[PDB]
Amino acid sequence: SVEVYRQKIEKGGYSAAYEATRRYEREEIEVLSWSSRWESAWSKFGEAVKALGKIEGAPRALVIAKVQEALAYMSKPLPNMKLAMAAAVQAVRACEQLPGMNRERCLDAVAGALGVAKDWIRREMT
Amino acid sequence: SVEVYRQKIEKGGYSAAYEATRRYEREEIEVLSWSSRWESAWSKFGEAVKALGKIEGAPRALVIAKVQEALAYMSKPLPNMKLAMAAAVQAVRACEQLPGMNRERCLDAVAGALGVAKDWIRREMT
Amino acid sequence: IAETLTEKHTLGIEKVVATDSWRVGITSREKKLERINISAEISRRIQDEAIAYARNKGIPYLPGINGIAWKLLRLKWLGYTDQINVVMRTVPAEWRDFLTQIMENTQMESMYSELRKVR
Amino acid sequence: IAETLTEKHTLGIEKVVATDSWRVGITSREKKLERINISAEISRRIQDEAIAYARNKGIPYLPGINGIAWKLLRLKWLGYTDQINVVMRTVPAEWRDFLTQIMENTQMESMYSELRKVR
Amino acid sequence: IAETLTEKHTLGIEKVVATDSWRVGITSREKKLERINISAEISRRIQDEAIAYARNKGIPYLPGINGIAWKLLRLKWLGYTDQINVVMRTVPAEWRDFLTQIMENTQMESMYSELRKVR
DNA sequence: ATATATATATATATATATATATATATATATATATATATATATATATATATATATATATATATATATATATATATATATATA
DNA sequence: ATATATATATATATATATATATATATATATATATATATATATATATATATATATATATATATATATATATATATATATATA
Numbered sequence: 001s002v003e004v005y006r007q008k009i010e011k012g013g014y015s016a017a018y019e020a021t022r023r024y025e026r027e028e029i030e031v032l033s034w035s036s037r038w039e040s041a042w043s044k045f046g047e048a049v050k051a052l053g054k055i056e057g058a059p060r061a062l063v064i065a066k067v068q069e070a071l072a073y074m075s076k077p078l079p080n081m082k083l084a085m086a087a088a089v090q091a092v093r094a095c096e097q098l099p100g101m102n103r104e105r106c107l108d109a110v111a112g113a114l115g116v117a118k119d120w121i122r123r124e125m126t
Numbered sequence: 127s128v129e130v131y132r133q134k135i136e137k138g139g140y141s142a143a144y145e146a147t148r149r150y151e152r153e154e155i156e157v158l159s160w161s162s163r164w165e166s167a168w169s170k171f172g173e174a175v176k177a178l179g180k181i182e183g184a185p186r187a188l189v190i191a192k193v194q195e196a197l198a199y200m201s202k203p204l205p206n207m208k209l210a211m212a213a214a215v216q217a218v219r220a221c222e223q224l225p226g227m228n229r230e231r232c233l234d235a236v237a238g239a240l241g242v243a244k245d246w247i248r249r250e251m252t
Numbered sequence: 253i254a255e256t257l258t259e260k261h262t263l264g265i266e267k268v269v270a271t272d273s274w275r276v277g278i279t280s281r282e283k284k285l286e287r288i289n290i291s292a293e294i295s296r297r298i299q300d301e302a303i304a305y306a307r308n309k310g311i312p313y314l315p316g317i318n319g320i321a322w323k324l325l326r327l328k329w330l331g332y333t334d335q336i337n338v339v340m341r342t343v344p345a346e347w348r349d350f351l352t353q354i355m356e357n358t359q360m361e362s363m364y365s366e367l368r369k370v371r
Numbered sequence: 372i373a374e375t376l377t378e379k380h381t382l383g384i385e386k387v388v389a390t391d392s393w394r395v396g397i398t399s400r401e402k403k404l405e406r407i408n409i410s411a412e413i414s415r416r417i418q419d420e421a422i423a424y425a426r427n428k429g430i431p432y433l434p435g436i437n438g439i440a441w442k443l444l445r446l447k448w449l450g451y452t453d454q455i456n457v458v459m460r461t462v463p464a465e466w467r468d469f470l471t472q473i474m475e476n477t478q479m480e481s482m483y484s485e486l487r488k489v490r
Numbered sequence: 491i492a493e494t495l496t497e498k499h500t501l502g503i504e505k506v507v508a509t510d511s512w513r514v515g516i517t518s519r520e521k522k523l524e525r526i527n528i529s530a531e532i533s534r535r536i537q538d539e540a541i542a543y544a545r546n547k548g549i550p551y552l553p554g555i556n557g558i559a560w561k562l563l564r565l566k567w568l569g570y571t572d573q574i575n576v577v578m579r580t581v582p583a584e585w586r587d588f589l590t591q592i593m594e595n596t597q598m599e600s601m602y603s604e605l606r607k608v609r
Numbered sequence: 610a611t612a613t614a615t616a617t618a619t620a621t622a623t624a625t626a627t628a629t630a631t632a633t634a635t636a637t638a639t640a641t642a643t644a645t646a647t648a649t650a651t652a653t654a655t656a657t658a659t660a661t662a663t664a665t666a667t668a669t670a671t672a673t674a675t676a677t678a679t680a681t682a683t684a685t686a687t688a689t690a
Numbered sequence: 691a692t693a694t695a696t697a698t699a700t701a702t703a704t705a706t707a708t709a710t711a712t713a714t715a716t717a718t719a720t721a722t723a724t725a726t727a728t729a730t731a732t733a734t735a736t737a738t739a740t741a742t743a744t745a746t747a748t749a750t751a752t753a754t755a756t757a758t759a760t761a762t763a764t765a766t767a768t769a770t771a
Contacts, residue, residue: 001722001723002660002722003399004399004400004722004723005660005721005722005723006721006722007395007399008399008720008721008722009661009720009721009722011392013390013392013720013721014662014719014721016390017720020386021719024372024382029382031377032144032147032381032384033147033150033151033253033254034380034651034730034731035380035381035651035652035730036730037255037729037730038377038380038652038729039376039652039730041729041730042652042729042730043729044728045653045654045728048728049653049654049728050654059655059656059725059726061654061656061726061727064655064727065654065726065727065728066727068727068728069727069728072727076642076643078175078176078179078186078642080182080644082457083457083644086457086458089457090453127735128404128405128407128408130281131407131647131733131735132404134273135397135398135648135649135733136394137271137272137276137733138271138732139271139273139731139732139733140394140649140731140732141388141391142270142271143731143732144384144732146263146266146267147263147731150263155263155266157258157259158265158266159491159492159493160262160639160742160743161259161262161639162493162742163742164258164741164742165258165261165742167741168640170741171642171740171741172642175641175642175643175740176642178642183462183463184433184439184461184462184463185433185434185435185439185737186435186643186644187642187643187738188435188643188739190643190738190739191642191738191739191740193739195739195740197740198739198741202630202631203629204630204631208342209338209339209342209632211338212338212339213335213739215334216332216335219334219431220433223463223464224463225461225462225463250338258640260639261640261641261741261742262639264638264639265638265639267639268639273637273638274637274744275637275638277637278636278637281636281637284636284637285635285746287634287635288635288636288745288747290635291635291636291746291748292634292746292747292748293747294634294747295633295634295635295748295749298633298748299749302748303568306568306569310569312569312570312571313750314750315632315749315750315751316631316632317632318632318633318748319631319749320632321632321633322633322634322748323634325634326634330432331425331426331429331430331431332431366634369634376653377652379652380652380730381651381652383651383652384650384651384652386651386720387651393732394650396648397648397649397650397732397733400648400649404647404734405648407647407648407733407735410646410647410648410734410736411646413735413736414645414736414737415735416736417645418736418737432737432738433738434643434644434739435643435644435737435738436644437644437645438643438644438645438736438737440645441644441645441736442644442645442646488646488647495628495629496628498628499628499753500628502626502627503626503627503628503754503755505744507626511625511626515626516625516626516757519624519625522623522624523623525622525623525624526622526623526624526759527758527759528623529622529623529758529759530758532759532760533623533759533760533761534759534760537760537761551762552761553760553761553762553763554619554620554621554762555761556620556761557619557622557761558620559621560621560622561621561622564621568750604622607623
């Protein structure tokens with residue numbers, strides 16, 4: 001819709017983001033502590049997605065999302081590897097239908113990204 | 127409901143949490159005395175609920191809650207181990223139904239978390 | 253500067269007293285507040301039968317038997333029954349029949365009110 | 372001076388509190404906000420069937436089975452069926468019939484609400 | 491800085507005089523206050539019997555025997571009868587018949603007045 | 610002798626505010642565990658559409674302000690035959 | 691008629707800068723609309739519990755304050771007979 005578009009335009013985000021950058025270069029803005037809590041937590045999800053680089057073909061968003069969902073379950077204070085393999089086998093099935101990929105080559109990419117053994121995902125695949 | 131959602135939005139919690147954060151970094155806010163009373167008392171419930179890590183499977187909120195309920199009675203100024211076992215045998219029965227867990231393995235996790243002997247919970251089980 | 257769990261609890265309070273979210277958190281709900289009315293009604297009904305039970309059998313009134321009988325009313329609703337069985341051994345002998353009187357013998361009046369309150 | 376991803380997150384927040392884009396981001400939509408209404412209804416509907424299931428079979432009420440049954444309702448809409456099959460092995464035995472009761476047996480009322488919410 | 495029980499008692503008092511919670515704590519009840527009226531009646535009813543008892547038997551009036559007989563009226567209502575028996579040995583001999591007069595012989599007037607007060 | 614305000618002994622009931630014991634329910638704000646849905650702002654992955662501001666490639670119209678070539682007309686100020 | 695500067699009007703073209711309109715694309719920022727997900731923050735809705743605060747409702751009691759009611763007496767003050 002245009003009416004939801006216009007109300008953000010009249011708030012003037014282009015000029016305000018320019019002054020926020022100039023204030024940073026004149027050292028009047030320091031790093032917020034929300035960002036220090038963000039980059040400390042997110043950084044394990046950033047390099048795990050880059051480890052799926054050798055998957056070729058289709059929209060690979062389902063392989064990326066189900067790997068990010070499976071990694072997040074292992075990062076709880078009480079980790080649940082049962083529900084983590086539930087999201088992992090959805091990534092293996094979504095990967096193997098792409099042109100060029102095998103079942104084991106998608107078992108290579110998923111278990112290498114999550115950093116677990118290949119046999120844990122093969123047991124739940126059936 | 128949407129109307130109860132809106133009245134907390136107009137109070138502006140996003141900017142107000144941002145200004146209170148910046149006040150902390152410029153040393154205008156010290157640690158409130160309620161927080162020191164909180165962390166001195168809660169800290170036994172945080173590290174003892176992380177001792178339930180090796181229980182796997184289903185929603186484990188019922189084992190988590192009744193172990194936290196069992197620590198509440200032992201931590202009173204007049205501790206009641208009789209009512210504390212009442213919540214402990216409920217956590218053992220709730221842990222037993224999960225796929226993969228045994229009765230003796232749930233007597234391991236519960237009694238190791240509370241820090242008591244295993245035979246106290248087994249006496250009330252019957 | 254820092255972000256530990258002590259000063260996270262503090263900075264969450266400071267945003268509450270700044271924008272006044274506690275009082276608008278109560279007055280905007282105003283539908284959940286009638287649970288306070290039903291809870292005061294049940295507790296009066298439990299206390300009155302507790303004193304009548306003390307005079308029918310000639311035992312002294314045991315304070316805090318209201319709270320035990322009110323906990324067992326709510327666990328009977330959820331289904332934590334081995335929670336009940338350890339508590340029934342813990343109370344004395346002449347008060348066990350009062351505790352099952354709240355649960356099943358005054359089921360219909362009292363369990364309906366918890367069925368109304370949680371709804 | 373610098374442009375890394377820690378400080379890109381900060382300078383985005385700084386322009387938001389400057390131009391007040393959060394509260395005008397919500398109040399200018401006013402159409403998607405009724406999805407909170409429909410989500411509040413399905414959460415009440417799933418939870419009531421979870422308690423009535425616990426009383427017809429005499430099992431205690433297992434908390435967090437509302438959220439498990441709500442995830443499987445949303446994945447059934449998308450088509451992630453081998454996602455479903457592993458979670459059905461993970462829940463205990465007496466509750467597997469409740470989870471397929473939400474998906475298949477309540478496909479009339481509950482699945483139409485998700486069909487109306489994402490629309 | 492510090493949180494001990496001495497200054498916890500102080501900081502609760504400081505929040506009372508700040509927001510005036512005492513005088514709004516009394517005026518908002520307005521239904522519990524008729525208990526003062528009924529307590530005024532039983533105090534007058536007990537004291538008039540005490541002087542008539544002192545004049546029928548020729549013994550001097552003993553101050554504080556109206557306060558003693560009021561405690562035995564309420565402990566009889568709860569059921570604390572073994573506490574009743576020791577105070578009956580403690581009161582002198584000519585006044586023991588007055589103490590069982592209040593509990594038993596004017597039960598109907600006085601035990602009802604306690605029974606309406608606590609309700 | 611009698612009424613009131615204050616402090617103090619003995620023997621008590623009742624109402625309130627506060628702290629403390631024991632046995633509980635309900636609603637609120639904060640932090641934490643588990644199992645979730647929905648809306649917003651921010652950063653990042655994948656596959657895209659549309660609008661704006663800037664920079665750059667290709668191949669062009671049109672209107673301004675400036676500098677330059679060629680071929681001219683007209684108005685002004687200055688210097689010269 | 692020439693020359694220096696300032697303006698207008700005809701044309702063909704180049705270059706620097708400011709704008710418009712056609713198109714295919716890249717990049718940096720600002721917004722919108724589709725989707726699956728992660729993380730930080732702001733809120734809503736279901737549940738089980740712990741802890742810190744304020745707030746009702748049942749109960750048995752202690753202690754510090756503020757008031758009421760029934761008695762016997764002392765002391766300080768205030769009034770009456």
